[PDB]
Amino acid sequence: RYQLEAVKGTSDPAMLADTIAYHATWTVAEKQEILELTDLEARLKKVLGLLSRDLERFELDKRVAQRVKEQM
Amino acid sequence: RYQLEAVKGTSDPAMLADTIAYHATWTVAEKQEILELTDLEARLKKVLGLLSRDLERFELDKRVAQRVKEQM
């Protein structure tokens, strides 16, 4: 959990947003598309949505695995 | 269950998993495959699934037998 200790110590939203977006390993094409934006709102919203989708898919996969265990 | 209760203080919980697998009635080949497995999580989930299935079979046997007495 050492990647969560580099997002504190300062009070500038832009730098923290940039480093959080960088820390999330995404595809290079989507990284370039994010970098193409001049503001941060749209890219932060996209990253948040992608992370929420990934968490939902992980939980769904675990629950489906348990359900398939019960089914077999 | 006295064998399992006599080894409560035994360390190396892989031993505990193997003993729980050995104390439940299924294929002896399955017992040997689980015991010789080096990893713990895989054997843990496999034995948990076997316990789920045999608990299901015994509970369904109990309710079937209740229906047996009711139908007679």
UniProtKB/TrEMBL annotation, chains A, B:
What induces the gene encoding this protein? By heat shock.
Q: Where in the cell is it found?
A: Cytoplasm
State the protein's purpose: ATP-dependent serine protease that mediates the selective degradation of mutant and abnormal proteins as well as certain short-lived regulatory proteins. Required for cellular homeostasis and for survival from DNA damage and developmental changes induced by stress. Degrades polypeptides processively to yield small peptide fragments that are 5 to 10 amino acids long. Binds to DNA in a double-stranded, site-specific manner.
**Which family is this sequence assigned to?**
Belongs to the peptidase S16 family.
**Could you describe the subunit structure of this protein?**
Homohexamer. Organized in a ring with a central cavity.
Q: What is this protein called?
A: Lon protease
Q: Which organism is it from?
A: Meiothermus taiwanensis
Q: Which residues of the full protein are shown?
A: 146 to 217 of 793
